[PDB]
């Protein structure tokens, strides 16, 4: 072992940010366009 962290590095493949997303309420296209517009532009 060495102090390298590939679980965090691999973790951003399918981020735990789908769990900070799912704590608060099911809300419609205003905040899904805010979160998924900022997310469709974060990957481009």
């Amino acid at each position: 072992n060495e102090e390298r962290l590939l679980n965090r590095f691999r973790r951003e493949v399918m981020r735990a940010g789908v769990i900070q997303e799912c704590k608060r309420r099911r809300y419609f296209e205003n905040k899904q366009e805010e979160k998924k517009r900022k997310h469709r532009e974060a990957a481009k």
Binding site: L5, K23, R25, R26
Partner: protein
């Protein structure tokens, strides 16, 4: 005592405000658990990476009656308690085979509750 086999799973319930470091065998009878509320301090302090380090250390320091070589860790959930816990287990340095995530990834099951507005 226990079955006395030095391989066994470790689960880390890293909550948004807490951590739980439990350790159990292959069948699932727990040999020890120790959380952030276990190791003394309690309140807004628990659930920080010092609580993950101390709770993991006081969790797996009591398996020296076993002396488990082949470790494997199965963490769960979001929070600031993951990376300090893995640095704690790698600090104890026992034969960590593979860490893994078993977090509940729902397929739109239940409605999560109201947004906070704070």
């Amino acid at each position: 005592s226990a079955r006395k086999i030095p391989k066994g799973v470790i689960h880390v319930q890293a909550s948004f405000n807490n951590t739980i470091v439990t350790v159990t065998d292959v069948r699932g009878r727990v040999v020890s658990w120790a959380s952030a509320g276990t190791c003394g301090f309690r309140g807004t302090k628990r659930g920080t990476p010092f609580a993950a380090q101390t709770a993991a250390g006081n969790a797996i320091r009591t398996v020296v009656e076993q002396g488990m070589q082949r470790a494997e860790v199965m963490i769960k959930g979001p929070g600031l308690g993951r990376d300090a816990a893995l640095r704690a287990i790698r600090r104890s340095g026992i034969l960590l085979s593979f860490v893994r995530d078993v977090t509940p990834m729902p397929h739109n099951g239940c409605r999560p509750p109201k947004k906070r507005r704070v």
